[PDB]
């Protein structure tokens, strides 16, 4: 559908477990979106020119493009668009503080309409792609005859 539905919909993050139950285990506290809810929450985007959601994201993903390609089915192309500019999308969507980077500067967030839930849609579109084998390693075609060394196995190293 024509994706400008921030007027007649309300923002709502995915399922959460209550506090009296969270305190026991060590698992996560949120859950993955459902299909009909992700296709709804990714529809509140406005495809605004000069997208602030991208100016303030340190890796600068093409956020409106996969937000569009998600709101119309077409999940595989959205995965391609998201992965082609970020190596660990799901890890980022899980840990990246969004209230200060992307969700905190959305155009509809500055106007008290709430913010498009970007990181949760990142998780959704990047984990539903893992289960169906759309992820593949980038083996080099022609092996070049050189060797490079790195120190450390953190995010930068990997």
């Amino acid at each position: 559908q024509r994706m400008l539905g921030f007027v007649h919909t309300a923002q709502r993050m995915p399922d959460k477990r209550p506090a009296a139950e969270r305190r026991q285990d060590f698992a996560e506290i949120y859950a993955r979106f459902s299909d009909e809810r992700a296709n709804e929450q990714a529809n509140r985007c406005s495809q605004c020119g000069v997208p602030f959601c991208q100016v303030h994201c340190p890796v600068s993903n093409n956020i409106p493009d996969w937000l569009k390609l998600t709101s119309e089915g077409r999940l595989e192309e959205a995965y391609e668009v998201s992965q082609a500019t970020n190596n660990f999308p799901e890890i980022c969507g899980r840990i990246c503080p969004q209230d200060r980077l992307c969700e905190g500067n959305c155009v509809i967030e500055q106007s008290t309409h709430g913010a498009v839930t970007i990181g949760s849609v990142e998780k959704y579109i990047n984990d539903t792609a893992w289960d169906q084998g759309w992820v593949k390693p980038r083996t080099p075609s022609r092996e070049l005859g050189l060797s490079v060394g790195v120190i450390g196995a953190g995010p930068a190293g990997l």
């Binding site: 007027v7 406005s46 991208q54 100016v55 600068s60 409106p64 668009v81 509809i108 075609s141």
Partner: protein
Amino acid sequence: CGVGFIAAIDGKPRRSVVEKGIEALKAVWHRGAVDADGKTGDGAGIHVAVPQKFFKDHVKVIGHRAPDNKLAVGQVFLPRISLDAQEACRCIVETEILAFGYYIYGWRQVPINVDIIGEKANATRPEIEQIIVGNNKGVSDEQFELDLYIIRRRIEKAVKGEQINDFYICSLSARSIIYKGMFLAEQLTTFYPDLLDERFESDFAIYHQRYSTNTFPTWPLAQPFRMLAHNGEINTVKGNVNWMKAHETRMEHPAFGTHMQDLKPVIGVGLSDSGSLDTVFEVMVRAGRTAPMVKMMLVPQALTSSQTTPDNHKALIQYCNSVMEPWDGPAALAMTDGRWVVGGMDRNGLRPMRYTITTDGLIIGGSETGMVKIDETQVIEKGRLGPGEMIAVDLQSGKLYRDRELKDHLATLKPWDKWVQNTTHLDELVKTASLKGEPSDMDKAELRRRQQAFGLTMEDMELILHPMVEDGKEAIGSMGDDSPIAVLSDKYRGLHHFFRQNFSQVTNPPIDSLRERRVMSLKTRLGNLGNILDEDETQTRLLQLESPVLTTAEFRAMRDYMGDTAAEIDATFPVDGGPEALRDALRRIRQETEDAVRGGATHVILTDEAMGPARAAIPAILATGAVHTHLIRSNLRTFTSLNVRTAEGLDTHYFAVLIGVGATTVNAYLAQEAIAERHRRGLFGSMPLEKGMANYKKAIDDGLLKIMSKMGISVISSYRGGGNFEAIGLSRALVAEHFPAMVSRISGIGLNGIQKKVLEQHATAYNEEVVALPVGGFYRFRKSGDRHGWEGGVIHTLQQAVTNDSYTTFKKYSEQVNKRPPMQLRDLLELRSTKAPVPVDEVESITAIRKRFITPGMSMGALSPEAHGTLNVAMNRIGAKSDSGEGGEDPARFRPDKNGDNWNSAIKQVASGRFGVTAEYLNQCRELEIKVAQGAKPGEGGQLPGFKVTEMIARLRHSTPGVMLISPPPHHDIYSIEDLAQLIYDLKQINPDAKVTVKLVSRSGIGTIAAGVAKANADIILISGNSGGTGASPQTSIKFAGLPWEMGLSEVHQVLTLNRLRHRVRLRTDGGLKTGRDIVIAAMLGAEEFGIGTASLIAMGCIMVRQCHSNTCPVGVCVQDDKLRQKFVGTPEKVVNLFTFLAEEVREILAGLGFRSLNEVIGRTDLLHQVSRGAEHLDDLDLNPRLAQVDPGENARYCTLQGRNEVPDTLDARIVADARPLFEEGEKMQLAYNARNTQRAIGTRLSSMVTRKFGMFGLQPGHITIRLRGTAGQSLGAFAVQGIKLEVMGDANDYVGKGLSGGTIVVRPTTSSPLETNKNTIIGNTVLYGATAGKLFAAGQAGERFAVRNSGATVVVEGCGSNGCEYMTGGTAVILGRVGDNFAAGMTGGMAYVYDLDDSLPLYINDESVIFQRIEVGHYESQLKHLIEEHVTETQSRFAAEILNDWAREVTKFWQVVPKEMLNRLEVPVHL
């Protein structure tokens, strides 16, 4: 300004004809341009028959013998400065005339009187003489005329050989003579006393007076010409001359003979449009045809697909359209063959023409129906001329042919119907083509590799291609263009980005393509060009396509039909060619094309399917330009066609430029491949592929029509190969060599830059493993795309600095703006003074500078009420002027609030729709403004979605709630510059205190338009740019139309200074102004005031969302919904702080330079230098064309007069001096005067006084009544309020009841006139244009465009013309007669009743937006009854009396027309 003609029907010479011609010339002084000198004119001319007895008596007196036959008299202009060039001209004329054997009687000096000419028209006056040549060989008359024409052409060529200037032959014939010059109209018989003789008698006479746009007159440019007289202007001359250059190389006729060799360059140099048209007219007439046939072949009629015309006329028009390319443009013609006398109109019927027959067998025609005084009991029939109509007089037989009789007589000469059957269509060819040969689509990898090679991103397929295939219409954007220009860019911008489109300002009107689509044709013909001087069946044997764009299957069918006559040409250059491979490839292809055409090939297919990893593709535009220009220069374009197969064609602007350069048919296969590939993935849904292709083709054709209609061209055959574009950034040599006629005022890249860009993109595409397309930024900002003017940090910094009120943050913003790489023309200029800096506090105050900024107009339809009111209250607080824009205004805002806020607006606009223009809307402002063209969408009308129209805006514009409101592209009032002068006179009459501003758009050729509008007593000029914002408009018009204001402003300033006119008008610029440096640069270039616009919106909260058209802007700036309007965060102090900072920056800069006021820096261009970007970009831009300094002289470089430029005074003054008891005592009155056609806008000033005193509805109807007897002027009773009643006995010229506001007008024939009231034209074109309330009862037939944009008026007329009741919105209109074609077009509100006796309405009506039925409800019958009763009571007609007498049997003859949108909103349903 005007044309006119007088003819004796029977054909007997008499002095009364010349007497009436001079009397008619004596009464056109109100339309011309008045001058303070009193002697300076701008052209005048008369054209009559030769007085044989005069010259024969002269010859007798000299001493010769009076010959038997008719004489030949030539009138020549010789040089006056040197006494030796005269002798050379004389000996040339005598050695060329005596070469045939005719006897020369001698020369005669015409008596003149040089005490009446001005000074500027006298310094270039030529020596006027006459030569008397007699015929002694005894040859017939027609052979004698042919010899004289050949001799004239030979003399012209010979005198051009010796390069002698100031030489002209005004006429050389044995039938007619021409007296013309550069004097005033009334002083014609004073400069030429010969016409005061008693022996000058003729049977026909033509007269013309013109209106120039400059003040440097030259005598050889004064009409009438030789067998033509023209009023208006022709749009397509750059394209018609290029087609004549190809037609010449094959024309020949046995009448001329060998001397044909001396008539090959038929169109010389140094002529106007009406001169070239006249030359081709004469060369076609002198070869056998007759004047009606030539008029039909040059300016044909609109070939309509309606059953309202017999098939004979259709066949004739088909033949005429096939043989020759039409000469479009607004044109009223009064031409004269040696035997016929014709008066004709163009295809659209813009200019007016009205005629009259007397009982003396005398026909008088002209632009105004009151020029020649005629006793009112001598007329037999009055009439008009519709679109394409004509009226002719046969002098040799003494007969008068009206339109229909002339067409029926002309459809008899040749069997046209038997001839037209030779043509073959293409749909038959694609249907008989077997369902075989379907090739296989390319691979996804191959398609992506071929798309990446040209720069097609994924956003050119998700944004501008999906809507085309889905719906059938182009995309829509909602903001200006802030992307860099082509040459200053850094990505791969295609070559079609360097060509800006064209459009028409006041000199020509655009054409509406949504409603007047029946007069626009997209026919294409292969195998058409040939001998244009023949009449045979082999002329109409060709192939005809219904659209210049072809699909792949249609292309294959056409190729198989062509067969072994086509020749394919490669268009690829080797990537390993070297540093000059592209030039070599161009050479190669332009040689192979010529070598193949000489070998019998009659079709050229220029393909580029050989593009691979080692061959790059030549830009298609360059290839087709080179090929077409070479074929034209070598006299071979007349033999073949030109078919192009492009791989980059995806948008409508591509096809436009390819057909404008010269291509015949354009094929785009890659777009079709992409559509098929996107379809097989299942993105469009459930629609078949053929439906998608049909939708795409329909969208492309509609976009082509839109681009074509911005200039005024209604046919594609005369638009092809004309060069209706402007190149910005291409080198002068390249354009002048490969493109026919385009202007590149600044040189740019040559061929090496193009080659470099092409090779870089090709290598990137073909040596890198491509897996997807880049997202790309051209319409929306992306980090990988190009740079934009408004980024994120800039917006945030500006909003912070405006909210928190910290000047340091504003300086931070300004520095961030002024630090980016160059993006616009004003980024290469640098300020450099020579004085010493002064202290800052010494410069003028901030108030005196803030009073120089204004905010532009932004309609209430686009913006919200809160934002509009906020801007208005913020700009009235610092002392500067605001603007309201189109869309009207709220009257409750006319008084200051209780807190002191003033929500009014000091500048009211008069748009093309006249959506809120009332009599009170104009008396509440300090400066009026006429909007000719907007910056974002030039040559078009503003739009408004159907859901943006709430109840409040519906009540404010007097429209229907919930219907798309699209403005008309043209003005319906401004069809030339004399109409602009009339409109400015009207506006200055209605508001005696305000100034009139004319708003234009930057382009090439704006200097002459500005010099013309400065003579119409306009006193403020506004020059917009190409980067201005808008509410909603197509994307191609946003990105590919206009020019930067650096060009327009610097052209207007110089042209105005050159004509000694700068000291009268002010200059104002806007579009892309962000900082103080921009303002100082604009002030140096010549401007005085400035408009800001978009930046202001950013100060109130707008964050460049670019969804204004969708009615869902989150902040709530351009929204009409309520839940979103509740989010507004604007505040006037924000705008005040913005303007304060912007003025303080200018003060800082002026202090740093060394001046103490803006007046000291205006016009001082020499304080600007041009710096280069570096030695690594290699662009040869030279901005010197805008740094040239024209020295002013005595006057200053800016406006130096207070108050508006005053205008003459009409009859209204006397009325104000007579009805004083109404204004002091408060009582009724009754006045009676005599109206003459030289009195304009009768009853407008009185309306102003009444509005200021009582208001619009303060007086009962008929409180003050005026009775006039005679032909009223133009705009009679414009802007009349309730309480005023005008009663004219006679007729009105035009614009009667324009902008009515509650008044009442009654027009009826005089009591002693023996005329049928229902069969004579009584009023003219454009009646009740944009009326809001009142009544109008006429007892005759109206003109064209009757009751356009009616909103509340009520009119009862006894007839109508074409295009009547167009785009009406409210009121009731009763028409007791016949109507014209395209009736009730675009109507969206109101009701109509037509009294059809012949039952011919279902053929004329435009039955798409309105439904017509028969009256079945009594409540609507009583309405009609009361309206006709009121008509009978007012005008005392006899037709309506008869209709009222026999009511029961005539009620069943009325058709009721009701719009579709009002079918479920009315109170009483029209059904049962």
